[PDB]
Amino acid sequence: QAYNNKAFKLYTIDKVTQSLVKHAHTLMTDAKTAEIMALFVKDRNASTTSAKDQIIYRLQVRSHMSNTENMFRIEFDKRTLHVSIQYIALDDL
């Protein structure tokens, strides 16, 4: 009634927030998953990195999980907060 049915995508806000919460919960409490975020912490906190740091970070992330899993390159740019996500599933192997 308020939005003239333009707010229909907000009908499941509780369920989507619950699913996000569940995904965060299994994000810290899974083996071969939390150390990837720890590596992200080390990469983000330690700035002024060259390219070779980026490739060794890539294979160090790869070595944590299985050889058949999928990698995702979620690029962030401070200027413009533009998150480009790239599909490199079984590409760097």
Partner: peptide, 25 residues
């Protein structure tokens, strides 16, 4: 080839962090 004061930051992730970030977006 040192990139000082970097602005583009890369997150490498499996399906779990990707799906979590997709739900956030």
């Amino acid at each position: 080839g040192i990139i000082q004061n970097r602005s583009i930051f890369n997150l490498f992730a499996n399906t779990n962090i990707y799906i979590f970030f997709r739900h956030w977006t």
